[PDB]
């Protein structure tokens, strides 16, 4: 129990305190969504969770140990797609996604891009793709990674209404496999309220 | 007769033809949304309309003269906010908005910044603004400028429900007097269907 846990996270930036006394546990199969406006510390909380930024007070625990002690067994099970897509612009769509695949590649990377909705754009430079199809290149990793923990930062930034449906169906079957999805978005989810666990930055 | 009038516009990227034969005249006080999938020629059409890019085969006319023939009577009354917000990330929220004003009284710029919901972040460098506060900096110009034609490309990209409602109200009242707003949104607008005149890519 307690696959991921937050232990009294504190983050204060200049005159504003983003949150205080946050303590939430996330077991297997939880679909957690962060709620807030454009001023609350949602991206800050997610970056504290990923270990990229160190909390001012408190610590984050993966499976029972801090993130700096298990920083080699943690990134094995982790999936971050932030506000910035994290993909090289000058490469074509294939080798950008070919980088993130361990084994069996260039037989599965083609299939993932087909599911994302980029059938026929596998060999076009990313900088020559549209502003929404650039997001789909990064979001194609959802169909390849075997990671147990997905932490997404507004995956519906510029995704078509058809596309957002497919992502919603993707991270709805990943959960009962035993995965964890920590989501933060402004468009409402097209799922029942019982499926999503809202947590607020109190 | 009338403002921007695309005439048998044609544009094709790679080998597919995005569109062929658009012919629409936009009279005063029309709210128009460019509808399409994630991959159609929405942004390309917008850049054709703003004169930044030349059409492959066709011409677009402002007030009866092509956009290269005026180029001064058109950029005075024009407001384009593309996928990239167009704001210098190193400056603060004020002097960045100060650049886009007529003179920058700093009495109307502050009023606009507080009006767009970005109150209290008026002196923080804009790179420290989270993810939509950066977009709010770009979209605060909807309250400063006196332009009579808004080419807004995905303005609700990372803005919560309150900001979306405020922007929708502002655009609805601006288009009521004499304005014209060409809009490309994937999130459906929460306004009556009769208000928006949709044109599709054919």
């Amino acid at each position: 129990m307690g696959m991921l846990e937050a232990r009294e996270l504190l983050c204060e930036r200049d005159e504003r305190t983003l949150f205080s006394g946050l303590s939430f546990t996330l077991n297997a199969g939880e679909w957690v969504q962060i709620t807030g406006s454009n001023g609350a510390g949602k991206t800050t909380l997610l970056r504290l969770l990923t270990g990229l930024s160190r909390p001012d007070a408190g610590e984050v625990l993966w499976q029972g140990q801090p993130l700096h002690q298990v920083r080699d067994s943690y990134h094995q099970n982790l999936l971050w797609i932030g506000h910035q897509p994290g993909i090289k612009t000058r490469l074509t769509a294939l080798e950008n996604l070919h980088f993130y695949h361990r084994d069996g590649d260039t037989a599965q990377c083609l299939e993932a891009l087909a599911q994302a909705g980029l059938a026929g754009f596998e060999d076009i430079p990313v900088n020559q793709l549209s502003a929404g199809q650039q997001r789909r290149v990064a979001l194609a990793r959802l169909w390849l990674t075997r990671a147990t923990l997905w932490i997404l930062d507004e995956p519906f930034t510029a995704i078509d209404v058809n596309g957002v449906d497919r992502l919603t169906q993707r991270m709805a079957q990943h959960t009962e496999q035993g995965g964890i999805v920590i989501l933060t978005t402004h468009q409402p989810l097209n799922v029942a309220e019982s499926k999503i666990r809202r947590i607020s930055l109190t | 007769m009338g403002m921007l009038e695309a005439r048998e516009l044609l544009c094709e990227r790679d080998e597919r033809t995005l569109f062929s034969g658009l012919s629409f005249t936009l009279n005063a006080g029309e709210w128009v949304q460019i509808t399409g999938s994630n991959g159609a020629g929405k942004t390309t059409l917008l850049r054709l309309l703003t004169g930044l890019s030349r059409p492959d085969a066709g011409e677009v006319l402002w007030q009866g003269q092509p956009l290269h023939q005026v180029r001064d009577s058109y950029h005075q009354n024009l407001l384009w906010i593309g996928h990239q917000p167009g704001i210098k990330t190193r400056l603060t929220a004020l002097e960045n908005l100060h650049f886009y004003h007529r003179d920058g009284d700093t009495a109307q710029c502050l009023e606009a910044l507080a009006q767009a919901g970005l109150a209290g972040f008026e002196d923080i460098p804009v790179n420290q603004l989270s993810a939509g506060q950066q977009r709010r900096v770009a979209l605060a110009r909807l309250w400063l400028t006196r332009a009579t034609l808004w080419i807004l490309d995905e303005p609700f990209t990372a803005i919560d429900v309150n900001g979306v409602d405020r922007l929708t109200q502002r655009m609805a009242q601006h288009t009521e007097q004499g304005g014209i707003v060409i809009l490309t949104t994937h999130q459906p607008l929460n306004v009556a269907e009769s208000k928006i005149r949709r044109i599709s890519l054919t």
């Binding site: 200049d14 005159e15 | 190193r90 460098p125 790179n127 420290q128």
Partner: protein, 231 residues
């Protein structure tokens, strides 16, 4: 015991007056002992009295940078906020001492060399140090977000102090390679040794007072928003 809240502002303000008075008195005594009361060197005469203005500056140019390296090391391993402000508190003072050493060194060699800049071991080892100080200062003044300038500044200071002995030894060997050698190893006179000690100590106390004042300024700049600055 080390608590280090912004109570450190009060502690710093506590030491500035006495430290400043002591530094002024010591410097005045050391510069009246020289510049009129110490004997004169036989070779270069009254131009040798610049030792009290150049030797303390040259020594404390390295001393302040060593203190900055220690402060950066303390602020890195233990992640201490104020220990990183100590680097930015002493960087301008170290730069000023390096500049003073460079100026007093060149004006000292003008009677003998005949020109205002001969590329010597003493005047170039104090030029690369000035370059390091300038780099640190410029890096600290280029971050919009504080608490990042001070960790980056600490990393830069550590990188430089790792390379400092290498650069100094290379320059001390580079001089030997081209000119064959420098002029001669400067000697000291027993009747002119105590005033140099007193001037060095005065420069030490002056640097301490200056860094205390700069640390107060930087502490206020950092916590310009806390309610504890209600004064």
């Amino acid at each position: 015991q080390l608590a280090i809240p912004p109570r450190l502002y009060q502690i710093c303000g506590w030491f500035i007056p006495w430290l400043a008075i002591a530094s002024v008195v010591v410097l005045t005594v050391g510069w009246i002992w020289g510049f009129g009361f110490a004997p004169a060197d036989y070779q270069q005469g009254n131009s040798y009295r610049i030792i009290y203005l150049h030797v303390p500056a040259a020594i404390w140019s390295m001393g302040i940078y060593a203190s900055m390296a220690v402060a950066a090391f303390i602020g890195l391993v233990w992640q201490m906020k104020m220990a990183n402000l100590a680097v930015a508190a002493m960087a301008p003072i170290g730069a000023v001492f390096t500049f003073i050493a460079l100026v007093t060194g060149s004006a000292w060699g003008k009677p003998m060399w005949g020109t205002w800049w001969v590329w010597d071991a003493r005047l170039t080892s104090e030029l690369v140090l000035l370059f390091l100080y300038v780099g640190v200062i410029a890096l600290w003044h280029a971050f919009d977000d504080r608490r990042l300038a001070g960790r980056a500044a600490g990393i830069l200071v550590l990188i430089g102090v790792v390379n400092l002995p290498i650069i100094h030894y290379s320059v001390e060997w580079w001089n030997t390679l081209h000119q064959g050698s420098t002029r001669m190893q400067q000697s000291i006179d027993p009747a002119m040794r105590s005033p140099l000690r007193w001037s060095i100590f005065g420069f030490l106390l002056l640097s301490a007072t200056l860094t205390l004042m700069r640390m107060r300024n930087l502490i206020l700049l950092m916590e310009k928003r806390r309610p504890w600055v209600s004064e």
